[PDB]
Amino acid sequence: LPLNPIPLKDRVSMIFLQYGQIDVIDGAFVLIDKTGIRTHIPVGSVACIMLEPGTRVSHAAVRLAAQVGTLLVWVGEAGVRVYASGQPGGARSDKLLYQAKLALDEDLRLKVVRKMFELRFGEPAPARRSVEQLRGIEGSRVRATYALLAKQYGVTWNGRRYDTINQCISAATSCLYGVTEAAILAAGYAPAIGFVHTGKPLSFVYDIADIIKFDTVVPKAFEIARRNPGEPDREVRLACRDIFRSSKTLAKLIPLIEDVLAAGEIQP
């Protein structure tokens, strides 16, 4: 019998695996550990499975997870994304070509960036500004947000590193980047073709994610940072799960992407 992926909104957010070998026992996702205890994981219920160091996936596992439409992300320290696997087939050509044309035309690229801006701050972008000029404005507004939130929650802020507070922020955003990429793939678009961000293999993922990251996802990392728990990773991940549930993120991701690209005034 054929196996098909279920809609993204009906799925659970994310799961984190760390020490075990991942094989397939009777057509089901299992996680066996050194002691030999087994853990069954519903792949058709999770929209993205995060793989921490110490994990060993089997060929059948990666194959099965693709069939059910579940994204596999191998993550680093504090959940930073390293590699990702998914169905090579997938995405209607039209939605890819639709995305492509918007990036190939410099008139339509600006326009679509403007809606991202409009959705970001709530106000339309100022005129007579190029893409790289708008990126300058958005960059300045981002550091402003970061600084104020640190004052609102009362944390010591001096910068945004990529190497305690930054550990919380990076972990939280990494969670958002996961489901966002999983949504883009399921929606039928390419995560490589971005508008605001370019040159990077996850440009389009960052574009959609940065629109709503500061709304709920980021201010929570600051909240946890002040609390300074012994389990900063676990309490950030558990927080994001609740956020995605309450804010109905998965159900909100697909229409968000389609609304952004609709700014091109071109037939979808």
Partner: protein
Amino acid sequence: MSMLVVVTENVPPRLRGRLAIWLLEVRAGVYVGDVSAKIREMIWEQIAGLAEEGNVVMAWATNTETGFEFQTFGLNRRTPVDLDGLRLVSFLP
């Protein structure tokens, strides 16, 4: 989206694996999950297809008087009984 519960007995490992793809096997042959209407009816197609000489019953939450409904597949000592619209189960010896 409503709660779903599937109980399988004497069922081949093919289906026992398939159900673990969407549902959670809390006990031996007992699966629990929360799916939508459309997802529920595909699981039933998996059950009706992959189950050989085995009996399976599926119960899900609804807005009926009881608050839930259930359909069965295969033969078992506990078969459903209709009591004026209300469906219960009897124990056949």
